[PDB]
Amino acid sequence: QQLYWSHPRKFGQGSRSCRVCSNRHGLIRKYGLNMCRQCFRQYAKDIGFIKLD
Amino acid sequence: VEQKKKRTFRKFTYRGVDLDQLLDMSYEQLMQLYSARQRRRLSRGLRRKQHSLLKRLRKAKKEAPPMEKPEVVKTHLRDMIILPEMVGSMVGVYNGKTFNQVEIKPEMIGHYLGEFSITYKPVKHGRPGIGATHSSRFIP
Amino acid sequence: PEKFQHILRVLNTNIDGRRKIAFAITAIKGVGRRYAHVVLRKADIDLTKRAGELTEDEVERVITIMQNPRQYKIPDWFLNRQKDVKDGKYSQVLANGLDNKLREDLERLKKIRAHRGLRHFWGLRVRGQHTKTTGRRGRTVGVSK
RNA sequence: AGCAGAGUGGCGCAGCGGAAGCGUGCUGGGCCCAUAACCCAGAGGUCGAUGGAUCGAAACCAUCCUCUGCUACCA
RNA sequence: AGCGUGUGCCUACCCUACGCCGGCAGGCGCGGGUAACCCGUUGAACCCCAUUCGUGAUGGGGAUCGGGGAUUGCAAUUAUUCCCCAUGAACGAGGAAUUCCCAGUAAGUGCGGGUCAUAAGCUUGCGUUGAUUAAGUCCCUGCCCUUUGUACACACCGCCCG
């Protein structure tokens, strides 16, 4: 078949992935996020936060 | 190569030593000649299948007739330090589509391959277009 | 007091006796203010008086301490040039030789015809800089009919 | 040949004893949601030659040449 | 001086005291921190006190540019970033216009977080120093309510005449 399929991803914006579906572009790490800012909003009601200010 | 006085003779020996000494040196003595960025690439790297290039150059240089240069070895690799042993070969270097061929001089040592092949058209102009300012507008 | 002399000529540039010694010397190219406050102290003279108050005996020593800096124990890193390139030594370059040296390195980078010499010859920025909004000499552009 | 004007610093007209004067145009900006109108901003530089006063001369004043305007003949 | 933050997390990675070596960037040896526990009694800047320069495109300004040294990475060229020497430009308070602001507020000044393998002139918060001017009005720009007029309702950026 092939002798390659991959090349070093060890740092950068391609070696971390966000939990929408493996979406990116929307660089995220904060306090152990790995969680997408669009959906973070939809989880304002869900637990982690309730808005108070 | 057809130059004189650029690495031997009166005027210019490569940081106090001729090309002839360099060829007998290992990389170890060679890198200690001041050119800081070079020293990273050797001490870290140590041949990550640059093997493919360096054998073809020596090989083609050998088999080629005397007083004539070889054909070409081609590369998509624009990165590799130009070295004394490489001199006299002819290398085509991929840009985005085009293999621009270059002869290697002893005066190019230390530099990269990719500095001798450009990857854009220098630029011409122009005649400013329409919206090229706060005036372009209207038609009906 | 001290009416003895004022403006004088030294190597390749005319230096006034109006200004303080260190700052006076800086006008000569290849010598900055940082380079001069060293060389005066190796010469073991005041920098707290004017350049017109130096004697001929003193200034004769200055240029010697300047042009052989390694032999008067100014470090190699503190020079303009360390291993010039293709000359094989540590060097210190001064006024009219600086320009001659400079013009060589331009010529060299068009000899090999690297990216550098092309950018030089075209009159465009050598280092990584945008030229889209940087420059102008030019700006008169029109499009109407 | 008599009289008159000029011999650009973008254009056209050439303003006066302080190195572009006037009018206009081109190019850019401003105002306005937008256009017009309106308001601002430009531009390598003895301005045909030979001289004098002068701080200086297209421009203060002469000596010469050339092109034209009006008048008009030598040829 | 304050708001914070920190390895044991994503897949290979943190914040750093102390000792030693180097001008510097940095290297190297050891130790602590799950954190009101260790870094950090956060021994920050402007400010404050004493020398030097002298009205000079000057030592103001640091653009452009040459050479050299380090760090990150698989790779640094069209210079990733950082450091050293040299080079020393525009710029000497800014037209027509225009923005924002009423009390710990404006302005000056530094710091933490965010993105981050390497890297803020950005954004988001925090302290520190701390004024002048107003206590009003519908003039301009715009908005709310009533009354009035309308050939308008795709609603005046409307409609319509020779």
Distance between the first and last residues' Cα of chain C: 76 Å
Q: What is the element string of chain C, with H for helices and E for strands?
A: EEHHHHH
Percent strand of chain B: 5-15%
- Helices of chain C, by number, come to 5
Function (chain B): Component of the small ribosomal subunit. The ribosome is a large ribonucleoprotein complex responsible for the synthesis of proteins in the cell.
Organism (chain B): Oryctolagus cuniculus (Rabbit)
Family (chain B): Belongs to the universal ribosomal protein uS19 family.
Subcellular location (chain B): Cytoplasm
Topology:
The structure is cut from a larger assembly and holds chains A (53 residues), B (140 residues) and C (145 residues).
Chain A: H1 37-40
Chain B: H1 19-22, H2 27-31, H3 37-43, H4 51-63, E1 73-75, E2 90-94, E3 99-103
Parallel strand pairs in B: 1-2
Antiparallel strand pairs in B: 2-3
Chain C: E1 8-10, E2 13-15, H1 21-25, H2 33-42, H3 56-67, H4 95-111, H5 115-122
Antiparallel strand pairs in C: 1-2
Chain C binds 2 RNA strands through residues 19-20, 22-23, 26, 29-35, 48, 75-85, 91-93, 98, 101-102, 105-106, 114-116, 119, 125-129, 139-142, 144.
Please, could you describe this protein's structure?
Chain B: This is Small ribosomal subunit protein uS19. Chain B: Component of the small ribosomal subunit. The ribosome is a large ribonucleoprotein complex responsible for the synthesis of proteins in the cell. Chain B: It comes from Oryctolagus cuniculus. This is part of a larger assembly, with chains A (53 residues), B (140 residues) and C (145 residues). The longest helix of chain A has 4 residues, at 37-40. Chain A starts with 36 loop residues before the first helix and ends in a 13-residue tail after the last helix. Chain A has a single domain, classed as Ribosomal Protein S14/S29 (30s Ribosomal Protein S14, Chain N, Irregular). Chain A has one helix and no strands. Chain A has one helix at residues 37-40. Chain B has 140 residues and is of the alpha+beta class. Chain B has a three-stranded mixed sheet, covered by helices on one side. The longest helix of chain B is centred in the middle third of the chain and has 13 residues, at 51-63. Chain B is elongated. In chain C, helix 4 crosses helix 5 (115-122). Chain C folds into two domains: 1-75, no CATH class; 76-145, no CATH class. Chain C contains five helices and two strands; from the N terminus they run E-E-H-H-H-H-H. Chain C starts with 7 loop residues before the first strand and ends in a 23-residue tail after the last helix. Chain C is mainly alpha-helical. At the B-C interface, loops of B face helix 5 of C. Chain C binds two RNA strands through residues 19-20, 22-23, 26, 29-35, 48, 75-85, 91-93, 98, 101-102, 105-106, 114-116, 119, 125-129, 139-142, 144.
